Amino acid sequence: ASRHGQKGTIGITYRREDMPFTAEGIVPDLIINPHAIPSRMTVAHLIECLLSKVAALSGNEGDASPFTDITVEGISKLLREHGYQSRGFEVMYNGHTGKKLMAQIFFGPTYYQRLRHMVDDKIHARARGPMQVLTRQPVEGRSRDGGLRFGEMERDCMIAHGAASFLKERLMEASDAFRVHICGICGLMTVIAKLN
């Protein structure tokens, strides 16, 4: 994530050759979607990138402190003084073909954070395993090799669909399921099942 409430998982890794490139030969370490911008309205993110680009060029720390008189225009002036189009845009060539892109890419340095929650500490699959003692139901948690909970909300979904037998298998074959002997008179779990 960026310092602007911009959560994001790696969708894919591309090697240098497949990456869009600058005429200088610069290439991104990261590609964020333009669609994650207009709704969120996190303008500071775009400004940070602008300022940070001038910072790396001039070899000066960027003043991204709040209540100041640092303007986008003022930063844009200095970036142009470096031979780059003032609003962060840069001509980029497609890694696959080498052809120029019809769109110029707003590209520059942006401080990104490597957060907790990594696929590998999260993946979990279970296909029969540890059963709780009382309930005789699959145990809880990835850590204990547990069974995922097919809650009522999920039960309701299946009903809607009209899948009577998938709902039965989910609640019997996977999870629970037991064979009890009933008295045809009192109808209770009394019967002393002396099998064999």
Partner DNA sequence: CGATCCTCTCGAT
Closest distance between other proteins and the C-beta of residue 189, in Å? 14
Q: Which range in 18-26, 75-83, 120-128, 172-180 contacts DNA by CB under 7 A?
A: 120-128
| Backbone dihedral angles phi then psi of residue 173, each to the nearest 5 degrees | -55, -50
Please report whether residue 165 would count as binding DNA according to CB under 7 A. no
Kindly tell me the burial class for residue 189, based on how many C-beta atoms sit within 10 Å of its own C-beta (0-12, 13-18, 19 or more). exposed
- Residues making contact with Zn ion (CB under 5 A): 183, 185-186
- Separation in Å, CA 130 to CA 63, 72, 137: 56, 59, 8
d(CA 86, CA 79): 6
Q: Any known ligand binding at 186?
A: yes
Please report whether residue 140 would count as binding DNA according to CB under 7 A. yes
Please report whether residue 9 would count as binding DNA according to CB under 7 A. no
Give SS3 for 93. strand
102 CB neighbour count, 10 Å cutoff: 5
Q: Any known ligand binding at 49?
A: no
Which positions from 131 through 150 interact with RNA, judged by CB under 7 A?
A: 132
| 134 half-sphere exposure, CB direction, 13 A CA radius | 0
Please report whether residue 7 would count as binding DNA according to CB under 7 A. no
| Backbone dihedral angles phi then psi of residue 169, each to the nearest 5 degrees | -60, -40
Length of the chain: 196
Q: Which range in 11-19, 70-78, 128-136, 141-149 contacts DNA by CB under 7 A?
A: 141-149
Closest distance between other proteins and the C-beta of residue 157, in Å? 4
User: Which does residue 143 bind out of other proteins, Zn ion, DNA, none, counting CB within 5 to 8 angstroms by kind?
Assistant: DNA
For residues 175 and 151, the answer to whether their CB atoms sit within 8 Å is: no
How many residues touch DNA under the rule CB under 7 A: the total is 13
Nearer to RNA, 35 or 116 (CB): 116
Closest distance between DNA and the C-beta of residue 151, in Å? 2
Binding site, residues? 183, 186
User: Can you give the binding site for DNA, defined by CB under 7 A?
Assistant: 121-122, 124, 140-143, 146, 148-149, 151-153
